[PDB]
Amino acid sequence: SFTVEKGIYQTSNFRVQPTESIVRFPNITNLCPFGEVFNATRFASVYAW
Amino acid sequence: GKGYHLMSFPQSAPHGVVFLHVTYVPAQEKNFTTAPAICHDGKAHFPREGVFVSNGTHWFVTQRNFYEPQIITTDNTFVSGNCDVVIGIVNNTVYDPL
Amino acid sequence: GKLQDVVNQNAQALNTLVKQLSSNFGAISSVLNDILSRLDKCEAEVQID
Amino acid sequence: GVLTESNKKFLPFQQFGRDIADTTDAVRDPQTLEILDITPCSFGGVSVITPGTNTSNQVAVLYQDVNCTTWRVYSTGSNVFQTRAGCLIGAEHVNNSYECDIPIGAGICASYQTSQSIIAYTMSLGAENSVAYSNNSIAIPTNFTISVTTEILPVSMTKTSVDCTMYICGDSTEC
Amino acid sequence: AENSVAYSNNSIAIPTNFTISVTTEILPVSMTKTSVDCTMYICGDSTECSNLLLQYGSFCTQLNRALTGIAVEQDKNTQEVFAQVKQIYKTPPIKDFGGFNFSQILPDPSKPSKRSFIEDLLFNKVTLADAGFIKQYGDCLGDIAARDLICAQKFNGLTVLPPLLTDEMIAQYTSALLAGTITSGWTFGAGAALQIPFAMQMAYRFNGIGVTQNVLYENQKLIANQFNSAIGKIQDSLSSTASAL
Ligand SMILES: *[C@@H]1O[C@H](CO)[C@@H](O[C@@H]2O[C@H](CO)[C@@H](O)[C@H](O)[C@H]2NC(C)=O)[C@H](O)[C@H]1NC(C)=O
Ligand SMILES: *[C@@H]1O[C@H](CO)[C@@H](O[C@@H]2O[C@H](CO)[C@@H](O)[C@H](O)[C@H]2NC(C)=O)[C@H](O)[C@H]1NC(C)=O
Ligand SMILES: *[C@@H]1O[C@H](CO)[C@@H](O[C@@H]2O[C@H](CO)[C@@H](O)[C@H](O)[C@H]2NC(C)=O)[C@H](O)[C@H]1NC(C)=O
Ligand SMILES: *[C@@H]1O[C@H](CO)[C@@H](O[C@@H]2O[C@H](CO)[C@@H](O)[C@H](O)[C@H]2NC(C)=O)[C@H](O)[C@H]1NC(C)=O
Ligand SMILES: *[C@@H]1O[C@H](CO)[C@@H](O)[C@H](O)[C@H]1NC(C)=O
Ligand SMILES: *[C@@H]1O[C@H](CO)[C@@H](O)[C@H](O)[C@H]1NC(C)=O
Ligand SMILES: *[C@@H]1O[C@H](CO)[C@@H](O)[C@H](O)[C@H]1NC(C)=O
Ligand SMILES: *[C@@H]1O[C@H](CO)[C@@H](O)[C@H](O)[C@H]1NC(C)=O
Ligand SMILES: *[C@@H]1O[C@H](CO)[C@@H](O)[C@H](O)[C@H]1NC(C)=O
Ligand SMILES: *[C@@H]1O[C@H](CO)[C@@H](O)[C@H](O)[C@H]1NC(C)=O
Ligand SMILES: *[C@@H]1O[C@H](CO)[C@@H](O)[C@H](O)[C@H]1NC(C)=O
Ligand SMILES: *[C@@H]1O[C@H](CO)[C@@H](O)[C@H](O)[C@H]1NC(C)=O
């Protein structure tokens, strides 16, 4: 409504906005063995995977 | 309603009822000096209904909720025991019809 | 006001019931006709559920 | 959320901690091996005290659970008074005691009085008068008044009926 | 306990004495006023969740309307129970009520609050969950080690609003009721308070229960002693057990 009668009204609790964003990942730099997994000269049989 | 209830009147309102409570509210209080009983001939007198009051000199017996003083008389009070055990008892004469 | 409260409470309850028909409740839409017109009988049953 | 230093001791095979609500409390920081406690940054109730919007557009904000004696308040401005119910911002404290108009709480009420402004005050329980009690004094009424008081009581409410098929499935056979 | 009662058509048992018995009855009047925030409970801090919740605004308005009604109801309950009289009577400085002792059930001026002795015992015998209504953000941030339940409630949007009348003010109302009752009897309820000596008030009360008012006067000291002993018994009882409240 555009009109509010006399009284006291509960509103949403006090909000604090995030001031900045951070990202924390483990300290590692090696690339995963994509070549050894996908570029493998010899794949295994399905029964012995 | 506030005060002693005399009688109520009902009225209908939408989805409800309205009671007009006519009640009796005492209005004009006045101070008096009083005692629980009076010693007449060594025997204490207590009101059968009422209370002893005094306007300074004389002692009357009056009803509880309205100042209607009456002369102290045997038909206004009743006797029980001597006039020493009672605390706050006073001295006064108890009239008798003659 | 004690009786006007009763009248207003009943009227507001019914109006709230009418207003609450605009919720999706997880469905793709809050309107039966929209669901039945864009979806076949197959998943229209899931949404109408 | 807010990250703070934690005294929790995680086992070597643990990375997160959790409430009874299973929301994440503590996290082992992956770079430096320390435990950080996570907390929400939204906290504390807020109430708005207003007269009618046609009466005025001013409002006083009661921030419960904040001490105003920087702050977790939208705006300080002026007239910052620490009530027992919270921190009232936008209302002028007065030393008088009136009847309650807008109950703030904790024995504090607010009203809109005169330059018009919102005032806050401790309510008045009533007129303070004693009685001249004595062991040999009685007050007796010499007159009376007949008072007619009104008492309103609700007796019934509107009888309602509901059709499921027409509310849930209005004019839809498949529904 | 089985107890057969002797009966006959020409036999009657008449009392020859009496006891003034003071009993305690406890009644809840209000409960905690509570408020709920859908956004902060259902959707902790995510904006996506609040955007999704935007279509249930009617449901949340319904919930908060019901809770606000409950809160106003609690305030009205306390007001109607305790604000019977809007005249704050105060007891006279001299306490001469014909041997009756009201020290335990009257305000103590030598305490920060004006609660009586019995009121102090009662307030000490109930452990309030909140014990206050100011829980600052710093305090909840500084006790992450201790799993405080109030902080967990308040971080999910569940707040407890303070009651309108504080305990000191309800104590003031009760003290006014005591003062009016002992200084004027029932008259202060039925309009303006009319003073009457307490012995004569008790005489009226005795006449009310169908025994002549004299027996009080011939037994005023005994009745006062019995009342004092009963009050002391209540005081001792409330200070020993925990199931009373
Ligand atoms: C009512 O009258 C009797 C008359 O005897 C009073 O009794 C005397 O009171 C005086 C003062 O206390 C004593 O010195 C006498 O010894 C009493 N005489 C007897 C026979 O009792 C009595 O005091 C009067 N009551 C009041 C309240 O004054
Ligand atoms: C008791 O109170 C009533 C009114 O409350 C008094 O009646 C009034 O008396 C004055 C005296 O001239 C009149 O002018 C008024 O018109 C009366 N009012 C009504 C409604 O009738 C009455 O006099 C009082 N009686 C005593 C003994 O004090
Ligand atoms: C009515 O009961 C009370 C006891 O509750 C009696 O008062 C006791 O009387 C004896 C007499 O020796 C005293 O030893 C006690 O100290 C009294 N107790 C109290 C609290 O006063 C009283 O006597 C009985 N009434 C009658 C007529 O026998
Ligand atoms: C009424 O009962 C109390 C019991 O506590 C009597 O004793 C007093 O108690 C109060 C507690 O509020 C103390 O402050 C006083 O020091 C106590 N006085 C004494 C002599 O013990 C009290 O005396 C009784 N009232 C009367 C008039 O005797
Ligand atoms: C690299 O990893 C180690 C341990 O994981 C950590 O101590 C160090 O801070 C990391 N380097 C940087 C620049 O953060
Ligand atoms: C995979 O094999 C092809 C052909 O030798 C080569 O061009 C490509 O660079 C290889 N990719 C990776 C990730 O090793
Ligand atoms: C009765 O006495 C007291 C004290 O003198 C006084 O305040 C009061 O006004 C008196 N009552 C009336 C009706 O005048
Ligand atoms: C008390 O009342 C009586 C009779 O009405 C009268 O004779 C006497 O003068 C009055 N005394 C006082 C002090 O009013
Ligand atoms: C009433 O009080 C006064 C002073 O307090 C005293 O002189 C008088 O003796 C008392 N009367 C009775 C019956 O106790
Ligand atoms: C608000 O105040 C104006 C007068 O200034 C009046 O016309 C109007 O009816 C009022 N509206 C409400 C809801 O009180
Ligand atoms: C915090 O609020 C309470 C409420 O009375 C107050 O006593 C206290 O002084 C406030 N804290 C400080 C440092 O003033
Ligand atoms: C209110 O009363 C207190 C204590 O007497 C005083 O410090 C203060 O200045 C007063 N404020 C106003 C506006 O009267």
Curated annotation (Swiss-Prot), chain E:
Residues 116-137 are annotated as: Fusion peptide 1. Precursor of the fusion protein processed in the biosynthesis of the S protein and the formation of virus particle. Mediates fusion of the virion and cellular membranes by functioning as a class I viral fusion protein. Contains two viral fusion peptides that are unmasked after cleavage. The S2/S2' cleavage occurs during virus entry at the cell membrane by host TMPRSS2 or during endocytosis by host CSTL. Glycans are attached at residues 9, 17, 101. Disulfide bonds join 38-60, 43-49, 140-151. It comes from the Viruses. Residues 128-153 are annotated as: Disordered. Changing residue 16 to I: In strain: Alpha/B.1.1.7. This is Spike protein S2. Residues 135-155 are annotated as: Fusion peptide 2. The record marks 115-116 as: Cleavage. It comes from Severe acute respiratory syndrome coronavirus 2. Changing residue 156 to K: In strain: Omicron/BA.1. The chain holds residues 701 to 945 of 1273 of the full protein.
